[PDB]
Amino acid sequence: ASLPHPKIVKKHTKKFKRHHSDRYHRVAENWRKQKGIDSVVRRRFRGNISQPKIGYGSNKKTKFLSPSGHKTFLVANVKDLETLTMHTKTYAAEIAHNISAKNRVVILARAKALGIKVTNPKGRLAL
């Protein structure tokens, strides 16, 4: 139900955690580039963590596609949904986390009608 697209190649799936985020609690995994004068990481000694750089850039084509084949589009309500009325093999809808249980049936319904895909059906669902 989505376009052709080449094989989605990811090319560095692992996460890129900040150096020594595993060493001290106070240090969060969120990346931060090592600046220090000595650092093995900043200097790239064999055996250390890899750092983000632009060569890991994803294929411009397959970029942004979720496994399905669609760029996901965050959808708050039915008006928001209907922007995806044509572009169905292109986009799919993510229903906003803060959307009340009741309204999700309505968005779910309208999308089934319009043939638009929903990335997270059975959101606030009663089962």
């Binding site: 376009l3 052709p4 959808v75 008006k79 928001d80 292109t90």
Partner: protein, 157 residues
């Protein structure tokens, strides 16, 4: 809205292929493979069985027969790349082998009475020719297997 709408959106036409330039040319078999040459099947259901080459079908495969009464192997298809063509060979002049082709094997559980009959026709001639030479029949019934310190990379076959 939860997220601003994109300004572009692609087209949802899916383009045509480019006029490829590959063309199915025929496949000449390797010189060891001549009709009536004894084959050693290397893979599959009948691995290790010795077996008589018959014809080279249109889907690149080799018509094979055994014969059935000799060692349970039917008139069958087998891939050329999974067979050791042996040095030994039985004559196959008086065997019909015409009716067999791709469509003949085309799966339409329960074996047809045709197949069972064709087997007998083809076999009776082969077993006729086989029996001429001593121990060719017994050989044909025994299964091939590498013994200790067989070096295939310079064994003969």
């Amino acid at each position: 809205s939860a997220q601003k709408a994109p300004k572009w959106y692609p087209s949802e036409d899916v383009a045509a292929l480019k006029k490829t330039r590959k063309a199915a040319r025929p496949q000449k078999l390797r010189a060891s493979l001549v009709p009536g040459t004894v084959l050693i099947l290397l893979a599959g259901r009948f691995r290790g069985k010795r077996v008589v080459y018959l014809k080279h079908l249109e889907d690149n495969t080799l018509l094979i027969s055994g014969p059935f009464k000799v060692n349970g192997v039917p008139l069958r298809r087998v891939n050329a790349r999974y067979v050791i063509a042996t040095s030994t060979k039985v004559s196959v002049e008086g065997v019909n082998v015409e009716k067999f082709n791709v469509e003949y094997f085309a799966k339409e559980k329960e074996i047809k009475a045709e197949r069972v009959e064709d087997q007998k026709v083809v076999d009776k001639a082969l077993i006729a020719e086989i029996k001429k030479t001593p121990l060719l029949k017994q050989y044909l019934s025994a299964s091939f297997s590498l013994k200790n310190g067989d070096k295939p990379h310079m064994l003969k076959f």
